[PDB]
Design an enzyme around this catalytic site. Structure first.
Site, mmCIF file in Angstrom:
data_model
loop_
_atom_site.group_PDB
_atom_site.id
_atom_site.type_symbol
_atom_site.label_atom_id
_atom_site.label_comp_id
_atom_site.label_asym_id
_atom_site.label_seq_id
_atom_site.Cartn_x
_atom_site.Cartn_y
_atom_site.Cartn_z
ATOM 1 N N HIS A 1 15.478 -2.263 1.019
ATOM 2 C CA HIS A 1 15.087 -3.427 1.818
ATOM 3 C C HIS A 1 14.292 -4.458 1.027
ATOM 4 O O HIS A 1 14.027 -5.526 1.585
ATOM 5 C CB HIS A 1 14.345 -3.041 3.125
ATOM 6 C CG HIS A 1 12.996 -2.393 2.966
ATOM 7 N ND1 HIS A 1 11.876 -3.068 2.522
ATOM 8 C CD2 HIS A 1 12.562 -1.170 3.351
ATOM 9 C CE1 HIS A 1 10.827 -2.261 2.561
ATOM 10 N NE2 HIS A 1 11.216 -1.099 3.055
ATOM 11 N N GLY B 1 2.992 -3.269 1.907
ATOM 12 C CA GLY B 1 3.043 -3.278 0.458
ATOM 13 C C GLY B 1 3.217 -1.906 -0.137
ATOM 14 O O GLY B 1 3.463 -1.789 -1.349
ATOM 15 N N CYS C 1 5.565 0.236 0.532
ATOM 16 C CA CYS C 1 6.909 0.774 0.468
ATOM 17 C C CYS C 1 7.275 1.090 -0.977
ATOM 18 O O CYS C 1 6.878 0.395 -1.911
ATOM 19 C CB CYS C 1 7.922 -0.204 1.070
ATOM 20 S SG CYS C 1 7.578 -0.495 2.841
HETATM 21 C C1 LIG Z 1 12.298 -0.848 7.090
HETATM 22 C C2 LIG Z 1 12.106 -2.264 6.629
HETATM 23 C C3 LIG Z 1 13.175 -3.159 6.680
HETATM 24 C C4 LIG Z 1 13.035 -4.468 6.256
HETATM 25 C C5 LIG Z 1 11.812 -4.911 5.770
HETATM 26 N N1 LIG Z 1 11.648 -6.247 5.355
HETATM 27 C C6 LIG Z 1 11.501 -7.298 6.190
HETATM 28 O O1 LIG Z 1 11.518 -7.179 7.410
HETATM 29 C C7 LIG Z 1 11.257 -8.628 5.556
HETATM 30 C C8 LIG Z 1 11.580 -8.863 4.229
HETATM 31 C C9 LIG Z 1 11.361 -10.107 3.666
HETATM 32 C C10 LIG Z 1 10.798 -11.141 4.408
HETATM 33 C C11 LIG Z 1 10.563 -12.502 3.791
HETATM 34 N N2 LIG Z 1 9.246 -12.688 3.166
HETATM 35 C C12 LIG Z 1 8.162 -12.724 4.150
HETATM 36 C C13 LIG Z 1 6.834 -12.965 3.473
HETATM 37 N N3 LIG Z 1 6.556 -11.928 2.488
HETATM 38 C C14 LIG Z 1 7.626 -11.908 1.500
HETATM 39 C C15 LIG Z 1 8.964 -11.667 2.156
HETATM 40 C C16 LIG Z 1 10.492 -10.903 5.744
HETATM 41 C C17 LIG Z 1 10.719 -9.660 6.310
HETATM 42 C C18 LIG Z 1 10.731 -4.041 5.714
HETATM 43 C C19 LIG Z 1 10.882 -2.722 6.132
HETATM 44 N N4 LIG Z 1 9.781 -1.840 6.093
HETATM 45 C C20 LIG Z 1 8.472 -2.128 6.317
HETATM 46 N N5 LIG Z 1 7.528 -1.254 6.125
HETATM 47 C C21 LIG Z 1 6.293 -1.768 6.525
HETATM 48 C C22 LIG Z 1 5.113 -0.899 6.462
HETATM 49 C C23 LIG Z 1 3.876 -1.319 6.937
HETATM 50 C C24 LIG Z 1 2.789 -0.475 6.881
HETATM 51 C C25 LIG Z 1 2.965 0.776 6.337
HETATM 52 N N6 LIG Z 1 4.147 1.218 5.886
HETATM 53 C C26 LIG Z 1 5.192 0.385 5.947
HETATM 54 C C27 LIG Z 1 6.314 -3.052 6.957
HETATM 55 S S1 LIG Z 1 7.917 -3.667 6.906
#
Ligand SMILES: Cc1ccc(NC(=O)c2ccc(CN3CCNCC3)cc2)cc1Nc1nc(-c2cccnc2)cs1
Ligand SMILES: Cc1ccc(NC(=O)c2ccc(CN3CCNCC3)cc2)cc1Nc1nc(-c2cccnc2)cs1
Lengths: 301, 301
Positions: free
Chosen positions: B41, B143, B145
């Protein structure tokens, strides 16, 4: 989210752990620059533990009596000296993995990570607090002496503890890295025992803030107490007094949650007087006191 | 003596953690030989998280879109491929600190250490169990991940977990190092939620043996139960069934303490039906289920 007993990453300390053998006694040492630090009781014999005179015992040693092994390499000892209850073995090779470091004595109520070691080989890492009675509730077996406790700030390791002994109740006692014991303990065989302990109030409050940050709110209430009135309750339950400096240190956590310290204290008073009524806080059924305000801020949002 | 939530020393993993940036998204990767593993992701955009097609998103990437930083050195990406929910970034430099390693998928009820990392920099280490519902109760912030979970056997790191996401209840979900999720979770935005969980019975019994080894005996009694009769009680309290294999695995601990497994089960039945009556076991007021029999043997006498 979530809240764990979290230690510092142990790699910078792993690269400093060696094995020190004198006679038939093996324990761990800490190799920094060209010096290996270890508990002086490595020079004890079985017919010495009652009333040993360490100055005599060390006078009778030579460098060649100390076998120091760093992984698979034997280090040549070229000098030996005593500093309080630790030994300093000067070796002919500086440790190439020496981190930036400091020797820093901690206060009761502060926390640190322990790298448990046997035969100079790291076995596990866990988080400890220095109890008000200057013991630590560690996890150590025979052979663990010389294992160290530490904190890490940016790139710098602050060593604060070297393990020396287990007391009769199964808690642990040791020194700072200058060889000075924490608490009224000595490195010889006596009837010594841990004194009465108390609960670290500021840490319990810090941990209640961690709980609120993590969505545990059931113990909150609409009441505020005075510092004086809170401390009357703390005394009754064997909690340490809360000072204004403690209130100040909890300021950031108070501001992040919007819960005044003396508001949270009214919650703690009710938990002490009433219990939890079968509920838990951050996965615990008792009030946890081994997380500092700094630990909570570092780990929580 | 003593019993702690003890992690494996994290140094061998610290030397593998890097930072991976794609666009404005930064997370952690694991650098082993000439490959960097990270959650796929990292290639997601804000207008992609609902129904992303990762195959399309990766087809539209080039090697130069991936910025990989190992401490202060940028690594040049020379190939990229997807494997299930992880990305494999081939780099032009093999990691000189690569430990002996294995990719090994764990079972619910098993434990592992987590090296929490941000911006490719290790922050803390803690011990986790894989819950029966395939979540972990971790401690992770945005952050984190790409942080990994692992065990260490002699010199060999068995990587078992890579962190991908936080579920609505604040527990955590991720994959093995082949990119296959633990549990019925996906790396995209859905209403997904942790299913019902259960308590890991064999681990609770292991921890009661740890307690006996450490001198906590108040919960012991003169009764023995049958496996069938115990499991009737386990079902009522949302505990997993105890199997004969579990009894066998507890054999060493049973022999060291002299307490038959089905004797200890009579203690657990009474604790479940009556509670602790204000007492504690190994410093806990609840029955702990995140220590395996192996964890107890490794740590205890
Ligand atoms: C499963 C998954 C799928 C997709 C994503 N990524 C997104 O949703 C995403 C990716 C990029 C962006 C665009 N930008 C937004 C501003 N920052 C830079 C990136 C906006 C959203 C994240 C995840 N996982 C996540 N893990 C967390 C998390 C929070 C606290 C503890 N452990 C994990 C937050 S988002
Ligand atoms: C404070 C102190 C003073 C002196 C000693 N050393 C001795 O009593 C001693 C030293 C040497 C010998 C002789 N040989 C006996 C057989 N093994 C080799 C040595 C016999 C006894 C140990 C300690 N500390 C100890 N720590 C522990 C310990 C156990 C579990 C967890 N943490 C510490 C056991 S003894």
């Amino acid at each position: 989210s979530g809240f764990r007993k979290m230690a510092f990453p142990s790699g910078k300390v792993e690269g400093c752990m060696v094995q020190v053998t004198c006679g038939t006694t093996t324990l761990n040492g800490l190799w920094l620059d060209d010096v290996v630090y270890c508990p002086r009781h490595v020079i004890c014999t079985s017919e010495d533990m009652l009333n040993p005179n360490y100055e005599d015992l060390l006078i009778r040693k030579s460098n060649h009596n100390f076998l120091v092994q760093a992984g698979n390499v034997q280090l040549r000892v070229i000098g030996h000296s005593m500093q309080n209850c630790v030994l300093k073995l000067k070796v002919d090779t500086a440790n190439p993995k020496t981190p930036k470091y400091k020797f820093v004595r901690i206060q009761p109520g502060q926390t640190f990570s322990v790298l448990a070691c046997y035969n100079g080989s790291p076995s596990g890492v866990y988080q400890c607090a220095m109890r008000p009675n200057f013991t630590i509730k560690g996890s150590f077996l025979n052979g663990s002496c010389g294992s160290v406790g530490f904190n890490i700030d940016y790139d710098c390791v602050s060593f604060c503890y070297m393990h020396h002994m287990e007391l009769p109740t199964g808690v642990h006692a040791g020194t700072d890295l200058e060889g000075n014991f924490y608490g009224p303990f000595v490195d010889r065989q006596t009837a010594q025992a841990a004194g009465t302990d108390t609960t670290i109030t500021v840490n319990v409050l810090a941990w209640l803030y961690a709980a609120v940050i993590n969505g545990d709110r059931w113990f909150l209430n609409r009441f505020t107490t005075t510092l004086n009135d809170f401390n009357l309750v703390a005394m009754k339950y064997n909690y340490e007094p809360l000072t204004q400096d403690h209130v100040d240190i909890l300021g950031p956590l108070s501001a992040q949650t919007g819960i005044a310290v003396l508001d949270m204290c009214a919650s703690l008073k009710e938990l002490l007087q009433n219990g939890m009524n079968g509920r838990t806080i951050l996965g615990s059924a008792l009030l946890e006191d081994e997380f500092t305000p700094f630990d909570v801020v570092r780990q929580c949002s």
